[PDB]
C-alpha cells in the first residue's frame, strides 16, 4: 500500500476491524508498524488514526491518479 490508498483493516482487536481507512503515509524504515491509516469514524477513545503493518491491511482501492 501507499499514500492515498484505501485499505480494509484485518487486525482483529482493532476498533476498525473489517472497516475502511485511508493511508496517510508509509514509513520506509524497518519499524514494526510503518503504515499510518486514518478513519472517518473515531474509536472509543476519540482517536481516528492508527499504525498497522502491511499484512494487516487489504487494499481495496488504488490512490487517485
Amino acid at each position: 500500500v501507499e499514500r492515498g490508498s484505501k485499505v480494509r483493516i484485518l487486525r482483529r482487536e482493532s476498533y476498525w476491524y473489517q472497516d475502511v481507512g485511508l493511508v496517510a503515509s508509509v514509513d520506509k524504515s524497518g519499524i514494526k508498524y510503518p503504515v499510518i491509516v486514518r478513519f472517518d469514524k473515531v474509536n472509543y477513545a476519540g482517536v481516528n488514526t492508527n499504525n498497522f503493518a502491511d499484512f494487516e491491511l487489504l487494499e481495496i482501492e488504488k490512490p487517485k491518479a
Partner: protein, 137 residues
C-alpha cells in the same frame, strides 16, 4: 366455532353498560359502532378474536396500514442516511436536516415496498458480512 363470544348488541352486560353511560360525545356513537360491529364477552366488553375467517379485513386493514406507515418512515430514514454518506460532513447533515434531500427521500419512500423488493433482488439492500465491523471472537 367460538361460542363464548357473541355480538355486543345481543350481550345483556354490554346493553347495561350502554344504558349506564354518560351522554357525551365520547360514548353515544362509539357504543353504536361497538354494538353493530364488535363481539363482546361475558363481561360485556368488546373482545378482539383472531379465530374468524370472516371479518379478516378488520385484522388485515390496520396491520397493513401500520406496516405501510412504518416502512415508509424506515425507508425515508434509510434513503436519507445513504444519501448523506457521500457528503464530506454527514454528521452535520444529521444534526442539520437537508430539506431537499429529506423531501426526495420521502417522495421515493412513498413507494417503499417496491423499492425494497428491487433492492433485495439486486443485492443492494444488505452489505456483505466481511465489510461490517465486528468484535474479536
Amino acid at each position: 366455532a367460538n361460542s363464548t363470544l357473541v355480538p355486543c348488541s345481543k350481550s345483556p352486560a354490554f346493553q347495561a353498560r350502554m344504558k349506564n353511560a354518560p351522554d357525551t360525545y365520547y360514548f353515544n356513537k362509539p357504543f353504536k359502532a361497538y354494538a353493530k360491529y364488535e363481539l363482546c364477552g361475558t363481561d360485556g366488553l368488546p373482545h378482539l378474536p383472531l379465530d374468524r375467517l370472516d371479518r379478516a379485513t378488520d385484522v388485515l386493514v390496520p396491520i397493513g396500514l401500520f406496516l405501510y406507515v412504518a416502512g415508509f418512515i424506515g425507508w425515508s430514514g434509510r434513503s436519507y442516511l445513504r444519501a448523506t454518506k457521500s457528503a464530506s460532513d454527514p454528521e452535520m447533515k444529521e444534526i442539520f436536516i437537508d430539506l431537499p434531500l429529506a423531501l426526495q427521500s420521502i417522495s421515493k419512500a412513498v413507494l417503499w415496498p417496491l423499492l425494497a423488493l428491487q433492492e433485495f433482488l439486486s443485492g443492494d439492500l444488505t452489505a456483505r458480512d466481511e465489510e461490517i465491523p465486528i468484535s474479536p471472537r
